[PDB]
Write a protein that binds this DNA or RNA. Structure first.
Lengths: 185, 99, 141, 84
RNA sequence: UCCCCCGUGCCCAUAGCGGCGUGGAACCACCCGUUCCCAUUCCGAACACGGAAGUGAAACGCGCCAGCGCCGAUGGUACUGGGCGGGCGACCGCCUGGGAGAGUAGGUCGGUGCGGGGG
RNA sequence: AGAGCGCAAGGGUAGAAGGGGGCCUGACUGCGAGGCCUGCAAGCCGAGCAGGGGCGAAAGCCGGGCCUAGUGAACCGGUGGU
RNA sequence: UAGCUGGUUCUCCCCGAAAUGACUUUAGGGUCAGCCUCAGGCGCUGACUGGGGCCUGUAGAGCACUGAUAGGGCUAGGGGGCCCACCAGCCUACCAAACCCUGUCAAACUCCGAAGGGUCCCAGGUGGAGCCUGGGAGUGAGGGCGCGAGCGAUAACGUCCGCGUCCGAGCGCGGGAACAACCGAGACCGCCAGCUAAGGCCCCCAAGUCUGGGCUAAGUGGUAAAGGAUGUGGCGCCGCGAAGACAGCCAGGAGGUUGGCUUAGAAGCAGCCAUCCUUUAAAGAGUGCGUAAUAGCUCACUGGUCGAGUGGCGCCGCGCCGAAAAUGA
């Protein structure tokens, strides 16, 4: 959705940050300049739209331009967000990480077993004109001891792939019990 | 496949690059430092004689005397595939003193 | 009680630890996360004591996953022998963990299971720590 | 004082090293015979009027000044401005 | 004078790879015969000698999916010659000068010196 | 270039040092500008000079082996030559 | 005879260092360097930096090197079963190479790579600089503190190197109450001259009971923690709520159901497996209590009565406890 923005100049990080803002550096193919936004609404809004969806940041320079983030670079010590980078919107064969929602209640589950998800945001491609929001996929007939993955996922028509694709998406695993302390021996 | 810088042996301190293939001899005098050559003479691309053995011989010498009007002294034989078969051009009579 | 296996050499020097962690601060594996937080060593006793608290209270639950690995030669010396000769031997197989270094993640439980487990677990460690969820550590390889 | 049988080590050793490395820098006027570099492997292949001795020693062959050149798959090469 | 292929040096993997196109008259790979050369821990597969038969495929330069590869800034931290300050410890923070790798967009299947074969 | 390069390690090298062979025998005599190191002693490299060899047709290569321990000042005596 | 000891005396001035490296039947003895100083003889050269050229593999980082790797996954082979002796069909709650991807550990690992440092040429740089000589020396456990590696237990005012320096040689001066190296400052001598550094203005002791807006309630400040709390101010998130919240009251707070099951019996209630709906405004396969197990108090639910706020979470400061020794504070 919509967020603020401001053109950045030759100012240094800490200032913008420790004040109550956060700097960025947008680009797209033929672009690479520097920008920034405000903190509180950044933090808040990133919970919702995020890299899950598309951002439409408003520049006071006029153009309320829609882009996408990516690269965010934490401070790693007493940490939190500390420098988002921005790719800009196009229509070319672009790639990103689509969020997911695995739905249902299968057979490994219920008995006590537990799913091991290996991906929620996934490596795929599309044209930004498309809006393949967040893919909600299959978890009906699952069983412990087996795995599902690869090119076995649903496609909102058009969306091509970008992996190998035998990348393991998930697998159901046998839980942990204090009878593994019988192994403690 | 005769890398080995056999040319390092030829990177001694003077060169002379040539070649032999199908029906043609490719003989040329090269000075280096930048890789600036100098002299030329071929087998059939010269409308010389029509026999590889004989031609070879004198073609060397041909170029040699030409080089004598251009001013040289000593160099080194440059080639990758050879076994060395004299080819009594052997660019030796061919000015160089060769061998 | 796991470790490597007498690799290359067996005695290695002490250490002073300012702060960097080298990284390794996110989910990627499962879900709910326990995050270590001080400049110190992770004790094997506390490794499987955390594992205790876990499968202890939460039994027949779900699956828990690891990113860490305790391996350090605690150069210990014999007692009353008067100081000098030699370095010492590889006891206290601790690991090297600084502030902000996360480490433990649970999956397949209720929110509160994680919560309580992480409470008592934190009550055990030779220091203390924090805990959180899943939303803003997406993208970290 | 309850002092019991200790163990005895051996790890009290190392090597003793000279001043191994670039003896001369470039920009220095050299006088033929000056050893300019000590080295183990052929880390630096000797070059134009720069010679080598068994110990991979790159000394000065001529009168003048050190210079360097490197290409990818060839390595590190050194010459000296010659002067007549 | 704008200009087609090869002996061949330099640029350091954008030059390398699967593949995709490639030419042959001339160049080249060859082809061809072991008479000449001399050669093989055995084999003319390595190299010379000789051609009418004769190939463009396997080989090179040259034109490409750019999947792999390598090239990769922009911004920020990580620390830090230097200076000034708080700790049960362990640690830290402000200035000065710095600036990685990583994340990222992105880029290339070749850039080029001489000499000789020419529309 | 993860094989290997004589024994350990590092370096490094198939543009050899590794692996096959022909002829040989510079594992030269008397000097050596020059310097690295370096309190001293010591260790070390070295192109070029006259002698005069071996191979490569030559351009040229060899004043022991790819390198860093296998080495021990002095006093005293044996040895042949001069 | 003593590589070892006690003494070594009058005066002014100009100097000014060692505590480190080679070695020693040598370790507290001593030869060489090392800096001091003196006297003769030379001139930008000394530290330092701008510029520019060249060498490193350290912080940090990194899995592609050498090694460790948590996990899932999938995939080789077998162990192996059934299997056949004409040979092979086949299997794998197993052991599991590789690789994969999720992820990471490395003083003796490095694809990368700092600040830099070292030093070289031009230029700056008259200074108890720099060069040579020789004459005479002392000095060869240094140590404080910082910052960085180590045997050390992130113990010692153990500690061997490293850089750095003060003391040593400045236990000369001003602070630190008193304390060579924690900070300020090279003292040639006089001065009843003002400036001024450390720190200071409630005082002794020199200086504002200064001017101003918050914060603390213990004497925090006089110096402690892991952890614990309706101690207080300020920011901020979410809902119930004038259709009326919260809170106190009347009222149900049900039935299949005593759920299943086990169990001597297990009734929401010891426990394990466990999700239905119904008379509805409203009751949860039931929150704690209760019985031997029922029965029973219960609360969630819900309506009212009623009147204006209320309860929970995340955040930044100060105080609180955690806090017990041997002369008298």
């Amino acid at each position: 959705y919509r967020l603020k923005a401001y053109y950045r100049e030759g100012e240094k990080p800490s200032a913008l940050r420790r004040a109550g803002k956060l700097p960025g550096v947008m680009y797209n193919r033929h672009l690479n300049r520097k920008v920034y936004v405000d903190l509180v609404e950044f933090d808040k809004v990133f919970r919702q739209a995020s890299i899950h969806h598309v951002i439409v940041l408003e520049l006071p320079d006029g153009q309320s331009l829609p882009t996408l983030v990516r690269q965010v670079n934490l401070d790693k010590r007493r940490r939190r967000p500390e420098h988002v980078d921005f790719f800009v919107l196009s229509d070319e064969p672009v790639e990103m990480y689509v969020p997911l929602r695995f739905v249902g209640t299968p057979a490994g589950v219920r008995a006590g077993g537990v799913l091991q998800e290996i991906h929620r945001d996934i490596l795929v491609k599309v044209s930004p004109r498309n809006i393949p929001e967040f893919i909600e996929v299959d978890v009906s007939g699952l069983e412990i001891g087996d795995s599902l993955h690869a090119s076995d996922l649903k496609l909102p028509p058009g969306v091509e792939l970008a992996v190998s694709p035998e990348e393991t998406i998930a697998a159901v695993v046998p839980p942990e019990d204090v009878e593994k302390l019988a192994e403690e021996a | 496949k005769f890398r080995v810088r056999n040319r390092i042996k030829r990177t001694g301190r003077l060169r002379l690059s040539v070649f032999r293939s199908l029906k043609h001899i490719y003989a040329q005098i090269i000075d280096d430092e930048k890789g600036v050559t100098l002299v030329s003479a071929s087998s059939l691309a010269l409308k010389l004689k029509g026999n590889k053995t004989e031609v070879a011989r004198q073609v060397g010498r041909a170029l040699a005397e030409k080089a004598l009007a251009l001013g040289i002294k000593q160099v080194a034989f440059d080639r990758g595939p050879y076994k060395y078969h004299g080819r009594v051009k052997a660019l030796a009579e061919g000015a160089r003193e060769g061998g | 009680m796991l470790m490597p296996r007498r690799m290359k050499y067996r005695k290695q020097q002490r250490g002073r630890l300012k702060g960097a962690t080298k990284g390794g601060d996110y989910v990627a594996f499962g879900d709910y996360g326990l995050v270590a937080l001080e400049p110190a060593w992770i004790t094997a006793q506390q490794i499987e004591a955390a594992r205790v608290a876990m499968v202890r209270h939460f039994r027949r639950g779900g699956k828990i996953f690891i990113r860490i690995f305790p391996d350090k030669p605690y150069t210990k010396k014999p007692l009353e022998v008067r100081m000098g000769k030699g370095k010492g031997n590889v006891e206290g197989y601790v690991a090297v963990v600084k502030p902000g270094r996360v480490m433990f993640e649970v999956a397949g439980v209720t929110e509160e299971q994680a919560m309580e487990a992480l409470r008592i677990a934190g009550h055990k460690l030779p220091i203390k720590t924090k805990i959180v969820r899943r939303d803003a550590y997406d993208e970290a390889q | 004082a309850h002092k019991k049988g200790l163990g005895s080590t051996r790890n009290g050793r190392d090597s003793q090293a000279k001043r191994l490395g670039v003896k001369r820098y470039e920009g220095q006027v050299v006088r033929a015979g000056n050893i300019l570099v000590r080295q183990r492997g052929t880390r630096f292949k000797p070059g134009k009027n720069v010679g080598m001795g068994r110990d991979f020693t790159l000394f000065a062959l001529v009168d003048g000044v050190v210079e360097f050149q490197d290409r990818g798959r060839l390595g590190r090469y050194v010459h000296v401005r010659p002067l007549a």
